[PDB]
Coordinates of N, CA and C in Angstrom, one line a residue:
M1 N 81.8 -54.6 22.9 CA 82.2 -54.2 24.3 C 81.1 -53.3 24.9
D2 N 79.9 -53.4 24.3 CA 78.8 -52.5 24.6 C 77.6 -52.8 23.8
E3 N 77.9 -53.1 22.5 CA 76.8 -53.5 21.6 C 77.5 -54.3 20.5
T4 N 76.7 -54.9 19.6 CA 77.2 -55.6 18.5 C 77.8 -54.7 17.4
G5 N 78.9 -54.1 17.6 CA 79.6 -53.3 16.6 C 79.8 -51.9 17.1
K6 N 80.9 -51.3 16.6 CA 81.2 -49.9 16.9 C 81.5 -49.1 15.7
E7 N 82.8 -49.1 15.3 CA 83.3 -48.5 14.1 C 83.2 -46.9 14.1
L8 N 82.1 -46.4 14.7 CA 81.8 -45.0 14.7 C 81.6 -44.4 13.3
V9 N 80.5 -43.8 13.1 CA 80.2 -43.1 11.8 C 79.7 -41.6 12.1
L10 N 80.0 -40.8 11.1 CA 79.7 -39.4 11.2 C 78.5 -39.1 10.3
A11 N 77.4 -38.6 10.8 CA 76.3 -38.2 10.1 C 76.6 -37.0 9.2
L12 N 76.6 -37.1 7.9 CA 76.9 -36.0 7.0 C 75.6 -35.2 6.7
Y13 N 74.5 -35.8 6.5 CA 73.3 -35.2 6.2 C 72.3 -35.4 7.3
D14 N 71.3 -34.6 7.5 CA 70.3 -34.8 8.5 C 69.2 -35.7 7.9
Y15 N 68.8 -36.7 8.7 CA 68.0 -37.8 8.2 C 66.8 -38.0 9.1
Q16 N 65.6 -37.9 8.5 CA 64.3 -38.2 9.2 C 63.9 -39.6 8.8
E17 N 63.9 -40.5 9.7 CA 63.4 -41.9 9.5 C 62.0 -41.9 8.9
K18 N 61.9 -42.5 7.7 CA 60.6 -42.6 7.0 C 59.8 -43.9 7.5
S19 N 60.5 -44.7 8.2 CA 59.9 -45.9 8.8 C 60.5 -46.2 10.1
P20 N 59.7 -46.9 11.0 CA 60.2 -47.2 12.4 C 61.4 -48.1 12.4
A21 N 61.8 -48.6 11.2 CA 63.0 -49.5 11.1 C 64.2 -48.6 10.8
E22 N 64.0 -47.3 10.6 CA 65.0 -46.3 10.3 C 65.2 -45.5 11.6
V23 N 66.2 -44.7 11.6 CA 66.5 -43.8 12.7 C 66.6 -42.3 12.3
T24 N 66.1 -41.5 13.2 CA 66.3 -40.0 13.1 C 67.6 -39.6 13.6
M25 N 68.4 -39.0 12.7 CA 69.8 -38.6 13.0 C 70.0 -37.2 12.5
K26 N 70.7 -36.3 13.3 CA 71.1 -35.0 12.8 C 72.6 -35.0 12.4
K27 N 72.9 -34.4 11.3 CA 74.2 -34.3 10.8 C 75.1 -33.6 11.8
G28 N 76.4 -34.1 11.9 CA 77.3 -33.5 12.9 C 77.5 -34.5 14.0
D29 N 76.4 -35.3 14.3 CA 76.5 -36.2 15.4 C 77.3 -37.5 15.0
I30 N 78.0 -38.0 16.0 CA 78.7 -39.2 15.9 C 77.9 -40.4 16.3
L31 N 77.6 -41.4 15.4 CA 76.8 -42.5 15.7 C 77.6 -43.8 15.8
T32 N 77.1 -44.8 16.5 CA 77.7 -46.1 16.5 C 77.3 -46.9 15.4
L33 N 78.3 -47.5 14.7 CA 78.0 -48.4 13.5 C 77.8 -49.8 14.0
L34 N 76.6 -50.3 13.7 CA 76.2 -51.6 14.1 C 76.3 -52.6 12.9
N35 N 76.2 -52.1 11.7 CA 76.3 -52.9 10.5 C 76.7 -52.1 9.3
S36 N 77.8 -52.4 8.7 CA 78.3 -51.8 7.5 C 78.5 -52.8 6.4
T37 N 78.1 -54.1 6.7 CA 78.3 -55.2 5.8 C 77.2 -55.3 4.8
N38 N 76.1 -54.4 5.0 CA 75.0 -54.4 4.1 C 75.3 -53.3 3.0
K39 N 74.9 -53.6 1.8 CA 75.2 -52.8 0.7 C 74.4 -51.5 0.6
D40 N 73.2 -51.5 1.3 CA 72.3 -50.4 1.2 C 72.0 -49.8 2.6
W41 N 71.3 -50.6 3.4 CA 70.9 -50.1 4.7 C 71.9 -50.4 5.8
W42 N 72.5 -49.5 6.4 CA 73.4 -49.7 7.5 C 72.7 -49.6 8.8
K43 N 73.2 -50.1 9.8 CA 72.6 -50.1 11.1 C 73.4 -49.2 12.0
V44 N 72.7 -48.2 12.7 CA 73.4 -47.3 13.5 C 72.6 -47.0 14.8
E45 N 73.3 -46.7 15.9 CA 72.6 -46.4 17.1 C 72.7 -44.9 17.4
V46 N 71.6 -44.2 17.5 CA 71.6 -42.8 17.8 C 70.6 -42.5 18.9
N47 N 70.9 -41.6 19.8 CA 70.0 -41.3 21.0 C 69.7 -42.6 21.8
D48 N 68.7 -43.3 21.4 CA 68.3 -44.5 22.0 C 67.7 -45.5 21.0
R49 N 67.7 -45.1 19.7 CA 67.1 -45.8 18.7 C 68.2 -46.4 17.7
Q50 N 68.3 -47.7 17.6 CA 69.3 -48.3 16.8 C 68.6 -49.1 15.6
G51 N 68.6 -48.5 14.5 CA 68.0 -49.0 13.3 C 68.8 -48.8 12.0
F52 N 68.1 -48.6 10.9 CA 68.8 -48.5 9.7 C 68.9 -47.0 9.1
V53 N 70.0 -46.8 8.4 CA 70.2 -45.5 7.7 C 70.8 -45.8 6.3
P54 N 70.6 -44.9 5.4 CA 71.3 -45.0 4.1 C 72.8 -44.9 4.2
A55 N 73.5 -45.8 3.6 CA 75.0 -45.9 3.6 C 75.6 -44.6 3.0
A56 N 74.9 -43.9 2.1 CA 75.4 -42.7 1.4 C 75.2 -41.5 2.3
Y57 N 74.6 -41.6 3.5 CA 74.3 -40.5 4.4 C 75.3 -40.4 5.5
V58 N 76.0 -41.5 5.8 CA 76.9 -41.5 6.9 C 78.3 -41.7 6.4
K59 N 79.3 -41.2 7.1 CA 80.7 -41.3 6.7 C 81.5 -42.2 7.7
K60 N 82.4 -42.9 7.2 CA 83.3 -43.8 8.1 C 84.2 -42.9 8.9
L61 N 84.1 -42.9 10.2 CA 85.1 -42.3 11.0 C 86.1 -43.4 11.4
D62 N 86.1 -44.4 10.6 CA 86.9 -45.6 10.9 C 87.8 -46.0 9.7

């Protein structure tokens, strides 16, 4: 209804993208979940950058 996926996830830990395919996120922020069907790298949209983050770093608000 806005992008390919929502679900909402909560950043537990602060994450600095180590690659341009990753995203920089600060814990406490609520991100949009674009992909959670991947076992390792989830896709989230934060600020204006929608890329990958570690599944173990974000929590399901869903």
